[model samples]
Target: GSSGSSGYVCALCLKKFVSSIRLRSHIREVHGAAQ
Candidate 1:
């Protein structure tokens, strides 16, 4: 799922996200990742 160029996953949860920015926002607000 990770450790490769898998574009279909987010960096944290490995969930589907439209883009890196979107995934970061999801993690930042929803998953409470460091800003």
Candidate 2:
């Protein structure tokens, strides 16, 4: 059950995530860890 959200966005993918955690984790796993 994914909820619709706002504010948290991914620049590379240009998609919105349910939360900042998901967004961060998504990129971290897909695009490598960020400092």
Candidate 3:
């Protein structure tokens, strides 16, 4: 989740991704290995 003008949004800190690879990349960049 992320904070935005519209309020909290699920996974909105990043662009909506449709694939596991993309999500993985997103998590890796945003959350790092701990995620």
Candidate 4:
């Protein structure tokens, strides 16, 4: 679901987020992804 060009999703957890900013932040905070 993450590979989609529309909605932002966490590629790791496959969780749909409202925005890319939230998705990126969620990834960093939850998966410890680097900026």
Tell me the tens digit of each residue's lDDT in model 2 across 1-35: 89866579898988888888888889988866675
The residue-by-residue lDDT of candidate 4 on 1-35, one tens digit each, is 36646787788999999998988888888998784
The alpha-carbon lDDT assigned to residue 34 of candidate 3 equals 65
User: Against the unseen true structure, what C-alpha lDDT does each candidate score?
Assistant: 0.75, 0.82, 0.60, 0.85
List of clashing residue pairs for candidate 4:
none
Name the lDDT value of residue 14 in candidate 3: 51
In lDDT terms, how accurate is model 4? 0.85
lDDT, ranked from best to worst: 4, 2, 1, 3
In terms of TM-score, the best-performing candidate is 4
TM-score (all chains, Cα) for each model: 0.52, 0.59, 0.41, 0.70
lDDT of 3 at 15: 59
The RMSD of every model to the true structure, in order and in angstroms, is 4.4, 6.9, 7.6, 4.6
Off by over 4 Å in 3: 1-16
* Candidate 1 lDDT score at position 35: 45
TM-score result, candidate 2? 0.59
Candidate 2, clashing residue pairs?
Answer: none
Order of candidate numbers by TM-score, starting with the best:
4, 2, 1, 3
lDDT top scorer: 4
Model 1 per-residue lDDT tens digits across residues 1-35: 55865565666787997777877788878788684
